[PDB]
Amino acid sequence: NGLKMFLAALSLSFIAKTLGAIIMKSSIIHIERRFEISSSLVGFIDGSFEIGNLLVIVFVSYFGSKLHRPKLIGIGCFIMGIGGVLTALPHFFMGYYRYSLSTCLIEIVGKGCLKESGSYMWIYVFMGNMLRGIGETPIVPLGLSYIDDFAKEGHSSLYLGILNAIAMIGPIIGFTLGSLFSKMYVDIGYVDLSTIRITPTDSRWVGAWWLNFLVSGLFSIISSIPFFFLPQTPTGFFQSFKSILTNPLYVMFVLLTLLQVSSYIGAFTYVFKYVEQQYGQPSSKANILLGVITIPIFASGMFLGGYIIKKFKLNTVGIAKFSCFTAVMSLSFYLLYFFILCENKSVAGLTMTYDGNNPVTSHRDVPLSYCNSDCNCDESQWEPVCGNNGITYISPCLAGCKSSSGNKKPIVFYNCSCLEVTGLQNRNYSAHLGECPRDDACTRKFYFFVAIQVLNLFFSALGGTSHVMLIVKIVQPELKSLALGFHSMVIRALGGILAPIYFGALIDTTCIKWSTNNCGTRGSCRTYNSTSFSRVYLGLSSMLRVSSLVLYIILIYAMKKKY
Numbered sequence: 001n002g003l004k005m006f007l008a009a010l011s012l013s014f015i016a017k018t019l020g021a022i023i024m025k026s027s028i029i030h031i032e033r034r035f036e037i038s039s040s041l042v043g044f045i046d047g048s049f050e051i052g053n054l055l056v057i058v059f060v061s062y063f064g065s066k067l068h069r070p071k072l073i074g075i076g077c078f079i080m081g082i083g084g085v086l087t088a089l090p091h092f093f094m095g096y097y098r099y100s101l102s103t104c105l106i107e108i109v110g111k112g113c114l115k116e117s118g119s120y121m122w123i124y125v126f127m128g129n130m131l132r133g134i135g136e137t138p139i140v141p142l143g144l145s146y147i148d149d150f151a152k153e154g155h156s157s158l159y160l161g162i163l164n165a166i167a168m169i170g171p172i173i174g175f176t177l178g179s180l181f182s183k184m185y186v187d188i189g190y191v192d193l194s195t196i197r198i199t200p201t202d203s204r205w206v207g208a209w210w211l212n213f214l215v216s217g218l219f220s221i222i223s224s225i226p227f228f229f230l231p232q233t234p235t236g237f238f239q240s241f242k243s244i245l246t247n248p249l250y251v252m253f254v255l256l257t258l259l260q261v262s263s264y265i266g267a268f269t270y271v272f273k274y275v276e277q278q279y280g281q282p283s284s285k286a287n288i289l290l291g292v293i294t295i296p297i298f299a300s301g302m303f304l305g306g307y308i309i310k311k312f313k314l315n316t317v318g319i320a321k322f323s324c325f326t327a328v329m330s331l332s333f334y335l336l337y338f339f340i341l342c343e344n345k346s347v348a349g350l351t352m353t354y355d356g357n358n359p360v361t362s363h364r365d366v367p368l369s370y371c372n373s374d375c376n377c378d379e380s381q382w383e384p385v386c387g388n389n390g391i392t393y394i395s396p397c398l399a400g401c402k403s404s405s406g407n408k409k410p411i412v413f414y415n416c417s418c419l420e421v422t423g424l425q426n427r428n429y430s431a432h433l434g435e436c437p438r439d440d441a442c443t444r445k446f447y448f449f450v451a452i453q454v455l456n457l458f459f460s461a462l463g464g465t466s467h468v469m470l471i472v473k474i475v476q477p478e479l480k481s482l483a484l485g486f487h488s489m490v491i492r493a494l495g496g497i498l499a500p501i502y503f504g505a506l507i508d509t510t511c512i513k514w515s516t517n518n519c520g521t522r523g524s525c526r527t528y529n530s531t532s533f534s535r536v537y538l539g540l541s542s543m544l545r546v547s548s549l550v551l552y553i554i555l556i557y558a559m560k561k562k563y
């Protein structure tokens with residue numbers, strides 16, 4: 001079978017590598033409640049995976065190429081697997097877990113601090129998590145380099161497309177098992193599950209991070225086994241690392257992809273938030289289904305992109321042109337989102353006054369209306385109640401409603417002072433709990449967003465394999481492994497970490513309501529002005545793509561001249 005055998009082992013690693021990445025996020029919430037660790041330190045534990053990966057990825061790629069490549073992938077995979085077991089050890093070494101809107105009137109940090117003194121189990125998760133990052137280093141730079149050197153004729157692109165196609169399954173298997181395990185209690189098998197009172201919907205409930213990280217670890221350990229058997233074939237660092245740079249086509253190409261990948265990565269991280277705020281439509285009904293139909297199409301694009309490159313005879317200049325064509329199409333489709341925007345959310349007490357007689361320019365220092373003034377209720381509390389009129393209110397207490405139907409279900413307030421607007425005395429002022437449902441005309445618009453979103457992703461998916469394929473050709477044959485590593489480090493150090501963080505900083509200015517944390521001045525933002533959020537999130541995302549497209553035109557001219 002020649003190089004085909006190697007592909008099978010590599011594809012298995014790709015499923016394992018992606019599985020490790022998704023699992024940490026799918027269980028991160030459970031870990032915090034279980035270890036009685038401070039919220040601040042939590043980001044740090046999540047960060048542990050990234051630092052391990054970034055620190056060793058550039059060094060290993062250059063050094064790794066000289067050494068045999070099949071085995072190395074194996075050592076790293078194997079290390080990853082040990083980390084997975086290492087990450088979940090605490091559960092086996094810790095005792096049994098211990099549990100411990102309104103009508104108008106008319107300590108966690110301390111626990112962590114105690115734990116911090118001397119030695120605590122939170123260090124174990126961090127250590128183990130870092131091991132996964134170290135283990136990841138030789139899966140893409142060393143592995144991808146091997147396929148290119150020994151591929152026959154122009155077949156390398158097609159093989160890469162297949163691996164990505166297989167790689168997409170990783171998250172799929174990971175959400176099934178990941179969520180399924182969450183339904184299982186953390187000490188399953190140890191404690192009699194008939195006495196545990198907390199429920200999977202309960203805040204207290206702690207998920208099985210130990211089985212969540214055990215399956216990934218076991219999967220990674222088993223995945224390594226084929227590699228060891230495989231045959232080898234079917235001042236040095238500083239000098240070489242410099243040569244990767246001062247290579248006009250290559251240097252701008254890495255900056256070019258940092259900007260484009262950041263836009264895509266940034267968009268993916270906040271798309272659910274954007275969809276929820278702009279169209280009211282929740283991800284609860286969206287992500288649950290749209291997140292599915294999407295996987296095969298995204299996977300289909302990756303394979304098709306690889307196939308298109310393989311079938312046609314494409315040179316290095318040709319590949320770039322094809323990559324640019326996807327980018328032009330992606331941006332044009334991306335630019336279409338601005339046209340399809342619903343009207344701004346109307347909330348009493350923020351965009352407009354509680355009475356609703358006239359709008360207020362600034363949400364801050366909003367003077368309470370007469371209906372609002374009669375009831376003395378806290379401004380900070382948030383409880384979106386939808387009135388008969390259709391105007392959202394900050395809280396039922398703020399609305400002036402003093403009656404409830406019982407605790408059985410959202411109690412349509414018997415009367416609401418603000419809701420019963422002048423001219424409709426007969427009409428009821430009762431309100432229903434939950435964010436006001438968006439108007440029927442707007443819902444139709446939503447679908448337009450989702451249809452283009454799937455379509456845009458597919459076009460992005462078509463060119464997704466191109467970035468990796470293009471990079472190998474421009475750089476000299478000797479440094480292929482290193483070039484990918486430097487590019488991989490740059491994409492996952494800035495695109496991976498900086499993009500969401502600066503997006504959040506930029507996005508927050510638009511936000512109009514701040515939830516009050518016990519310690520933090522601002523913990524979460526309840527609602528964002530829709531036009532401001534749309535203009536800023538899409539605009540920043542689009543601006544990056546426009547810059548990305550501009551680089552391609554400059555690059556194409558440069559590439560054509562050299563070749």
Ligand SMILES: COc1ccc2c(O[C@@H]3C[C@H]4C(=O)N[C@]5(C(=O)NS(=O)(=O)C6CC6)C[C@H]5/C=C\CCCCN(C)C(=O)[C@@H]4C3)cc(-c3nc(C(C)C)cs3)nc2c1C
Pocket residue numbers: 018021022140164167171264265268291292294295298464465468491492
């Ligand atoms: C790490 O976690 C992520 C990261 C990014 C994701 C992403 O954004 C895009 C997919 C992602 C990617 O190709 N992922 C994989 C891969 O193979 N990268 S690669 O570099 O190997 C490839 C050869 C070029 C499997 C990950 C391996 C390494 C990531 C490399 C980081 C830089 N990079 C190229 C990206 O982030 C890209 C951008 C999209 C998605 C999607 N999720 C859905 C579902 C769940 C609703 C639809 S699309 N998941 C992602 C996950 C989970």
Ligand SMILES: *[C@@H]1O[C@H](CO)[C@@H](O[C@@H]2O[C@H](CO)[C@@H](O)[C@H](O)[C@H]2NC(C)=O)[C@H](O)[C@H]1NC(C)=O
Pocket residue numbers: 414415428429430
């Ligand atoms: C709104 O509140 C009023 C007062 O509690 C409700 O009931 C009556 O008020 C009128 C005028 O005083 C009279 O019919 C009686 O004094 C009250 N008893 C009833 C129930 O008739 C009114 O029904 C409420 N409207 C709602 C629930 O939308």
Ligand SMILES: *[C@@H]1O[C@H](CO)[C@@H](O)[C@H](O)[C@H]1NC(C)=O
Pocket residue numbers: 426428430
């Ligand atoms: C609203 O109140 C009116 C009486 O004013 C009553 O006839 C009607 O059935 C009520 N409808 C709802 C939605 O409770």
